[PDB]
From Swiss-Prot, chains A, B, C, D:
Source organism of this protein record: Clostridium symbiosum
EC main group: oxidoreductase
Reaction(s) this enzyme catalyzes, per UniProt: L-glutamate + NAD(+) + H2O = 2-oxoglutarate + NH4(+) + NADH + H(+)
Cross-referenced SMART domains: ELFV_dehydrog
Family as reported in the entry's similarity comment: Belongs to the Glu/Leu/Phe/Val dehydrogenases family.
Gene: gdh
Active site: K125
Source domain of life: Bacteria
Cellular compartments per GO CC: cytosol
GO molecular function: glutamate dehydrogenase (NAD+) activity; glutamate dehydrogenase (NADP+) activity
Database matches in SUPFAM superfamilies: Aminoacid dehydrogenase-like, N-terminal domain, NAD(P)-binding Rossmann-fold domains
Residues binding substrate: K89, Q110, K113, G164, S380
Protein name in UniProt: NAD-specific glutamate dehydrogenase
Site feature: Important for catalysis: D165
Gene Ontology BP terms: amino acid metabolic process; glutamate biosynthetic process; glutamate catabolic process via 2-hydroxyglutarate
Organism classification: Bacteria, Bacillati, Bacillota, Clostridia, Lachnospirales
Length: 449, 449, 449, 449
């Protein structure tokens, strides 16, 4: 589509200094050509040009004092990218690399991911260049208070609902929420999600991302007249997502056979499928040692230091740890191994070069992270519902809806790709399904945003 | 000061992509060494590190529709840099070059300028990459409405009071204000300054910047046991500031002998000192022709196309038009001419290379724009007072205070430079006087911002 | 002006059921032809069509309980007609005849009157069909509380500042204000004017309307190379306005020779010029007897029952009591008497037939009430200034400004009439001066309201 | 008055547990008998019963963390006692004895004091049982932030304007204000008074209480056909008030001859009348040593440890330090000495027994602190005016109004006492003048508060 190409070119030029953002826009917009060409009305109201500029961006100063009385200064961000279909929604990331480029790219993708859930959630991202590494609990608390002392005026249960991400977990959400309720003088606990149960968090929260990713893979098997049962799976990490996936894979008849750490990776041909094995991951996580070897030492399984587990021959690859984990190098190994299922779980775990490549392979099934990991934000949506109803749902209620939605995200994507003649292209399908709802809403709302 | 050098280095690295901002910080902070070295307490509360990061930055999407029904999208900014001593305050600039770097640099300087006025005004800057050139009146109106539809929630008479700048005049202020009062449902006319008289603008508004700059030069003459009477002056432009200065120079016994346009410059040895001559500038401005030749055609005076008037031998140089007007090339001519008085009137009309150079010259007097052009923002402060009192002052009241303050800005700067042993360095003096009030306020307010 | 005629015709048709409003619009708009014909731009933005429709109208239910526990229901109004040049401003009228027509007509005229003061005040009117006659003090208090319990959300010191009118005096203003400050939880005493001194009322309040009307007449004498000294004056009423006028006439060398009541009128060839005489009016007012005879009984002066004092031969006629007091019948007597000065003081004290007639008389000077009685609202403006400054001015400060403004309202009107070639037509002049400021502001504010 | 006696009896019974409050009510109400007996209408609307119950009381939890990371908990109060004539107004006291009783008594008296100023200021008091003694600057800052994090929602420039008192000075006001402006997102610097100049404090602030007390004494001399010149004066303390009084006494021809400290008192027959002597007080204050001996060591003047200076024979006694300083014991010495002028400067520096006693003495002049020390709150009122006008007044403007008002507070009190036949009773006169304005306002505002 000439219209699409034109917007990408203008973006590339205007936001040259924001490489991460430019690439994401290109990647998403480029898959929408067929849809946009079928809707000339979009161009007339400059829809794409509007979409690529966040509704509102806020940056602010965050001075705070350490345990020694020294004053530090960081910068806080919240990018409220698109609120056409629900209050802004998206996690908070505290990491020294954080800048506007990275917030806009994650925030643009968040809009598409949130649109897929089928719930009324807009897209946003925020965070700070504050580095939680090595800070005391008390230091993290004062930072969170000073961060919220400004942030509170831009968010709220019907406006913008943040949540956790890298560097931001239950603990930080708790401290921010305490400051919020104090300043505002009321409860409004739907202002943040990822909360502890005592003040409104949802059951299935910890399992959400991981289980969700397995329900999606299940819908993939079905599509392909195949089965999870018996399948082996390579994971990355030993964290939350990895824990949740391993757990549900095992329950489903499958088994994970690898985990990974900055120190290397393990191989466990038996499968991280026991209560004892599965639970230990929590331990290692706890431990704060940050080494995957511990599992190998504990269970007496292979530990290959300084190596990715992308070389092992398995049925399914699920990268659930960090960005740009799988590169060309690793993709080629995966290919060579004749792995059919490549399922992104963590955010942007694959480089593009790697992605196109995997995508050129005819026999392969490639699932994009914005769809596969939607389970967590989907449970954040259920948490906002529970908070608005002022009650809790049972675990069975939450898990059962989680399950039905993840299946629909898969099926919907396929149907959409197929409709625009793209085959079984889950990557473009996720983009298309996500874009359509947003477009419909923006077109109906007129030219205001 | 090691502390100062350290903050400049961290700024240079962190905001590499914001060259204009980096340079301004270096230029201002570097002159404060003596003051900072005398106040060790500043470093303990990380004062400079706080100061260089704006309290709050807001960017937002601005879709709007042209006379033909085509939809355009621009981006709006408001950088609320420092509000320690008054509501945020600073102009709006509509120009296609506008970006965050430029907003932060003008907004950082605005804090120092506003601090010098002696009135309670903080520092901010905002605007859009919208280009008013070639737009209809109706188009500018719809843009201003859509811009304000988001902006209103961040400003207010006690919070942030914008005003005009490049691309933003009475007309735009009028349209934004109409939208504001409609959305908010009340009067609150102190929300913007630069208003027309019918709805609360102040007398002496149009003359403000120009007259103020002449009262300052007057205080310079006095300092130097000299006199305006008889002096000749090179101006740049034929606009508002130039008009106001010429006018007051003439009244004071002096006379301007040049004006300037993108087309060249004129020389008028008699002096733009008559009602007829003086008033014609308004005409040319009106005319929208944008040519200084008109004056030469009209009055039959020299017109040197494609040339700056920096070569003419005069007593006083007052650049009142555009940035980086006076470069090394032009400074060397000025030097060669044995001009003692170089008085910046327009904002950053001189490059640094040019500035250091002029500043190395022992016999010369160099006045920085943040002090010299304070007259306009000073009248904006009087306008907020009048609006808060719900009455108007007479022209004599406003002009008489304008006069006394500009004298004090000069005298104060000198005294300050002298105190820290810098001689009669009006440039560092302006920075020091401005910084001190802000520092005092931030130190008293604690570590919150 | 064809444009003017067209708007009047559309008004007449659309608001047929609002006779009082239709007539006022016609009367005012018809005098603006020359101004509108000189400004084609007005028609392009449909300025007059906008002006004739109030920005906002609010009507509301007012249940309240009497001293016997019976529940009564009345209706409350506030018409916020035009706020282009200041917060809405205008009195509250409690009378059983009150309806929307009457509120809109008084509110449209209030905009023009407020514009003449030269202060930033918009135009509004409000009130209720509640009848204070025969109610207890306690009943009036509960009514005022219930009326304010809804009204408070539409007004405020920067939004809409009501004040007294027929049926609403200091006492009612006090009760409404008490309810306001309780609901809102703060002071904000600039929300209402006409307050008692103890909580922010202004000195010269009681004298305001009356004195103002005499300062205006003074400017008329000057215009006409004449003098107040020695002049005799027919007043109507024995109330506030009459009291204030008599008082200042006497001080100025003149003397009133009549007063009036529903019972008839008195004639006092000596002049209501003594402390004893002057003060007695207050008595009669107090007395609540409502009879002008009391003065005649007390001072032993003529009392002609059931008669208007419009028949007495005097230098100046100043009707300061009720509407449509002076009719054709009375105008013809005035004419026959060769009275040159006819000065409306009370609101619409003359019927139109009467007005045109007086206006056709070549030798006569006719002053419209919107200008002549501006003194009261002008002191309400000074009260808002004092409240905003959080201090009181002295009586001399208030009276001296009152005086200078009333002179300017006269002079300005004359100059304006003369400019559009209308002669010394104070009636059209008041309309023109008032309209111009409002137009300027609306044109500058764009098409929002 | 039976009505008065009845309200005192009901107060005594209902607030038995609040001794300080009960006594103050009795003391004030008992002097109002004559006024109340002249206004039967008061009893009908239960005016006194309303007056003795604060409009609103707020208490709140204040957790905060010390320099060692230990968590402390204190309690915060704000009693908004009466807002009939202006926003609530009154200081903040941080001392371990603070409780509701003490807040209500100081807050009830504050209403009467504020009413005397003639400015629109209501009456309030607040504070905490937090003890600033021995805390670090950083600790006081965190406390002030946590205190304001709750307090901000109850105050504001038009609602309730706190200020300093025991334990709360410029430094604490600065820290609270910084937190306020951060939470609220705007300037609103009129929210607190006693601010540093850099962010809106008024000139003459430090001198205010002391100078004011001397202008009042001056009006007393005049009343009594006497003179300050030559008079000697016993002060108490070496603080702010003492410094200000000594200073102005000296300028006026008088001289202080004593100062006092917890360590004893000094006698300086020459007079603390030199720049050197006067300025040294600041030193001692600074020093934080808390000993008056320093002055005696420095100037070589008598130092009587563990003794009050109430025994020295002087013309005028001005207790300017602490409560219940002058007891029966000290009063008897004063009496014995034939001192005619007893002028309370500090708050409640005299016990009642002592007060009645002094008051029974026929030849003596006794001035109550609520009137004499009104100078400070009067300058706080001028500061709110300056902040609302968004400018500064000169020192001469502030001092000259200070002077005229203090004279009026004296004269007004005398006239009032005399009117109700009480003689020259400055104590009852202050109560009566204060009560009358408040009563007038409450009666006009109806039964809402
Ligand atoms: N950080 C997760 C959770 C966000 C949310 O729950 O709002 C994400 O990227 O979706
Ligand atoms: N644009 C002018 C005016 C700003 C103002 O009046 O706030 C400046 O740079 O100062
Ligand atoms: N009722 C008066 C006073 C209104 C006011 O003071 O706002 C009028 O018609 O002007
Ligand atoms: N604490 C002083 C000052 C209070 C104020 O300025 O509001 C008093 O008791 O009056």
């Amino acid at each position: 589509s000439k219209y699409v190409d034109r917007v990408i070119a203008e973006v590339e030029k205007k936001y040259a200094d924001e490489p991460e953002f430019v690439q994401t826009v290109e990647e998403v917009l480029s898959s929408l050509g067929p849809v946009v060409d079928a809707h000339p009305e979009y161009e007339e109201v400059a829809l794409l040009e509007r979409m690529v500029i966040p509704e509102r961006v806020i940056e602010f100063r965050v001075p705070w004092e350490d345990d020694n009385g020294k004053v530090h200064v960081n910068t806080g961000y919240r990018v409220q990218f698109n609120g056409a279909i629900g209050p802004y929604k998206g996690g908070l990331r505290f990491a020294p690399s954080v800048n506007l480029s990275i917030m806009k790219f994650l925030g643009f993708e968040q809009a598409f991911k949130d649109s897929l859930t089928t719930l009324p959630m807009g897209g946003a991202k925020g965070g700070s260049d504050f580095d939680p590494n090595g800070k005391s609990d008390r230091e993290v608390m004062r930072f969170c208070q000073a961060f919220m002392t400004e942030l509170y005026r831009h968010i709220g249960p019907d406006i913008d609902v943040p949540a956790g991400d890298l560097g931001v977990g239950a603990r930080e959400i708790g401290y921010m929420y305490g400051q919020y309720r104090k300043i505002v003088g009321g409860f409004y606990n739907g202002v943040l999600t990822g909360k502890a149960r005592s003040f409104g968090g949802s059951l299935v929260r910890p399992e959400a991302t991981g289980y969700g990713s397995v329900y999606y893979v299940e819908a993939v098997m079905k599509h392909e007249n195949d089965t999870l049962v018996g399948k082996t799976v390579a994971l990355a990490g030993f964290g939350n997502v990895a824990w949740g996936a391993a757990k549900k894979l095992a329950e489903l008849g499958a088994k994970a056979v690898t985990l990974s750490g900055p120190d290397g990776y393990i191989y466990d041909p038996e499968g991280i499928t026991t209560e004892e094995k599965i639970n230990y991951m929590l331990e290692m996580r706890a431990s704060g040692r940050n080494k995957v070897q511990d599992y190998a030492d504990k269970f007496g399984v292979q530990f290959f230091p300084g190596e990715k587990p992308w070389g092992q021959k398995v049925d399914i690859i699920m990268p659930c740890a960090t960005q740009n984990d799988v590169d060309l190098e690793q993709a080629k190994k995966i290919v060579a191994n004749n792995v059919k299922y490549y399922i992104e779980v963590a955010n942007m775990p694959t480089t593009n070069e790697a992605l196109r490549f995997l995508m050129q392979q005819p026999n392969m099934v490639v699932a994009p992270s914005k769809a596969v990991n939607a389970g967590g934000v989907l449970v954040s949506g259920f948490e906002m519902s529970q908070n608005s109803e002022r009650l809790s749902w049972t675990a069975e209620e939450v898990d059962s809806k989680l399950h039905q939605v993840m299946t629909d995200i898969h099926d919907g994507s396929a149907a959409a790709a197929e409709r625009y003649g793209l085959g079984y292209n889950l990557v473009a399908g996720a983009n298309i399904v996500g874009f359509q709802k947003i477009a419909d809403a923006m077109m109906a709302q007129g030219i205001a945003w």
